[PDB]
Design a protein around this ligand. Structure first.
Ligand SMILES: CCCCCCCCCCCCCC
Ligand SMILES: CCCCCCCCCCCCCC
Ligand SMILES: CCCCCCCCCCCCCC
Ligand SMILES: CCCCCCCCCCCCCC
Ligand SMILES: CCCCCCCCCCCCCC
Ligand SMILES: CCCCCCCCCCCCCC
Lengths: 51, 51
């Protein structure tokens, strides 16, 4: 029983973490505002739809 | 008299136009926000202090 409970707990925890960090989709264009980049810059991902 | 008046008028008009457009100094770094440039970009002048 403990093993089954822990399996479910880990599954739920990983799903929640993924939802918080990324969501469940990826966009083609990303806006970056981190040094040393000046102001904001546009970046482009690889294979967003397939992913 | 008319010629002297017009000389002075033209001088004042040109000074006012220059003050409105540029001022009386130039900075080394310029911020550009015009298409097709994305977001804002930084540009650098030539010989700002001498000018
Ligand atoms: C000797 C008892 C073995 C049964 C273990 C079932 C519980 C496993 C919990 C896993 C916790 C996470 C470890 C990385
Ligand atoms: C089963 C794995 C648990 C891992 C817990 C780690 C938490 C990750 C950090 C949470 C977000 C921090 C944002 C500052
Ligand atoms: C069993 C439920 C499966 C449906 C999950 C749908 C998640 C939302 C995905 C939205 C993607 C839209 C394309 C950008
Ligand atoms: C025949 C009279 C000549 C005297 C002319 C003095 C006035 C000049 C006015 C200039 C106006 C701007 C012309 C471009
Ligand atoms: C003696 C020369 C007179 C020239 C007058 C031209 C005015 C210049 C335009 C004024 C600024 C327009 C901002 C939209
Ligand atoms: C007769 C008065 C002459 C003084 C004019 C000064 C104009 C202001 C210039 C400021 C430049 C400061 C360096 C960026």
């Amino acid at each position: 029983i403990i093993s089954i409970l822990f399996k479910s707990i880990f599954e739920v925890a990983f799903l929640l973490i993924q939802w918080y960090i990324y969501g469940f989709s990826l966009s083609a264009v990303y806006t970056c505002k981190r040094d040393p980049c000046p102001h904001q810059v546009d970046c482009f991902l690889s294979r967003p739809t397939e992913k």
